[PDB]
Amino acid sequence: PVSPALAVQQRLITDMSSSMPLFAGTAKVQKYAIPRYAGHVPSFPRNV
């Protein structure tokens, strides 16, 4: 049941990716910022 909202569409393809563990510590996985972000993003689930 995918909603037609914009943010759901933007993040649905990323959520289903087959290389999710390889994206850790990058700007894609930070849901609180637009991509190509510059600040620090944690790479451990306790910090995340």
Partner: protein, 442 residues
């Protein structure tokens, strides 16, 4: 119809935030770029097109780039409230600042980042069908504003050619100062700006502080107030493109009417009904009083005194409920005054504009709501005093080459200082010669 905005460095990005908040609130775009889904006015008018393009799903996106060498300000934009409005490619940030060195920005660091900026501007200009100029916001006192502003305007001027380039520029205040090396950066900036700009708008922070103290009753102003005032001025000048009116003014008409000779393009700006909410219900605000107001020295946003010079041209923008007869009576009354003088070679001294859209009220704002406003841009010989003071401060510092080793180590020849100082001296002589009154009777 279309205009492209380029924001450079810290002052230009912070003023950009105020500009785009204001332009959103006047059109009605939500911070996420979507039109209100419950709004059913039906007359889906084209006025946004000057500043926005549609994706096709009905999201709005703005015609701007944000350029910086330090990450922090762009990361503030990326993490703020307007995250979804901008395309992420549009927000360009480097690794390290230009460290108050014009030389570092122009030669060493800006040279790597500049090609991304040109590729983005090309991608914007290709998605236009009646582009009629660039708006640029920067400060000439800092390193990235000086170096990237010069380099980017030079490249734009070669690639795009005849297209107009209008700059809104924050100059170093005559006694308020923020960094030691401001005179050097302002001289080196102005040398490049002379060749590569069509109109230059002059701002001084001391005037906007004085204006906020005298008219508003604010003892402790901060940058958000100044930036909101600047945004209002830019909205007033660009309103003529966006809404119906009696006397429209296209951006090429500004250049034709304001610039008599190709170097004499630096202009003063002022805004009339800057007033607080408590005062606003005690007074009527007719056309003739605000027309008299824009000529009072308490109104300017640049620290210069116009009583020490002669006007060459004035452009008066009226927006809101105004009738042409009141504009004509006001301009004729101004013309009668004895303390307002025009150069004798300019008999028809005035340009008028009349627009129906009243000024917008911003939810957190400090200005009152008013039915009419007038905004003025004017060309006057008084501006020569600002350059004379920058050049005097340069001569004091340059007598000992006080900091020059940084600039020469970071890549600049010492000769460039003397060339720029002689060019600004020649600009002073140009303002001396144009203001000469001569008798052809001979």
């Amino acid at each position: 119809r279309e205009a492209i905005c380029i924001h450079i460095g810290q002052a230009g990005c912070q003023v950009g935030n105020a500009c785009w908040e204001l332009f959103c609130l006047e059109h009605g775009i939500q911070p996420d770029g979507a039109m209100p889904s419950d709004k059913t006015i039906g007359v889906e008018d084209d006025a946004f097109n000057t500043f926005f393009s549609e994706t096709g799903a009905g999201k709005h996106v703005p015609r701007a780039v944000f350029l910086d060498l330090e990450p922090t300000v762009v990361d503030e934009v990326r993490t703020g409230t307007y995250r979804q409005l901008f395309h992420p490619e549009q927000l360009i940030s480097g690794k390290e600042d230009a460290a108050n060195n014009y030389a570092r920005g122009h030669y060493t660091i800006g040279k790597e980042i500049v090609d991304l900026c040109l590729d983005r501007i090309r991608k914007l200009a290709d998605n236009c069908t009646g582009l009629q100029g660039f708006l640029v916001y920067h400060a000439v006192g800092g390193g990235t504003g000086s170096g990237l502003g010069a380099l980017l305007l030079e490249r734009l001027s070669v690639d795009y050619g005849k297209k107009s380039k209008l700059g809104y520029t924050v100059y170093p205040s005559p006694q308020v100062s923020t960094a030691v090396v401001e005179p050097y950066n302002s001289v080196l900036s102005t040398h490049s700006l002379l060749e590569h700009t069509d109109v230059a708008a002059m701002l001084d922070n001391e005037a906007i502080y004085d204006l906020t103290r005298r008219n508003l009753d604010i003892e402790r102003p901060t940058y958000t107030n100044l930036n909101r005032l600047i945004g209002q001025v830019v909205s007033s000048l660009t309103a003529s493109l966006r809404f119906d009116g009696a006397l429209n003014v296209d951006l090429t008409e500004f250049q034709t009417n304001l610039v008599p000779y190709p170097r004499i393009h630096f202009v003063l700006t002022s805004y009339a009904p800057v007033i607080s909410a408590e005062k606003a219900y005690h007074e009527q605000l007719s056309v003739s009083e605000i027309s008299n107001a824009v000529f009072e020295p308490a109104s300017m946003m640049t620290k210069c005194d116009p009583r020490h010079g002669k006007y060459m041209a004035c452009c008066l923008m009226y927006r809101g409920d105004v009738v042409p007869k009141d504009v004509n009576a006001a301009v004729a009354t101004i013309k009668t005054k004895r303390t307002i003088q025009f150069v004798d070679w300019s008999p028809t001294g005035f340009k008028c504009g009349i627009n129906y859209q009243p000024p917008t009220v911003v939810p957190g704002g400090d200005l009152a709501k008013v039915q009419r406003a007038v905004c003025m841009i004017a060309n006057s010989t008084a501006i020569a005093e600002v350059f004379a003071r920058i050049d005097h401060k340069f001569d004091l510092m340059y007598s000992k080459r006080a900091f020059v080793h940084w600039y020469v180590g970071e890549g600049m020849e010492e000769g460039e200082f003397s060339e720029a100082r002689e060019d600004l001296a020649a600009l002073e002589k140009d303002y001396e010669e144009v203001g000469a009154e001569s008798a052809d009777m001979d």
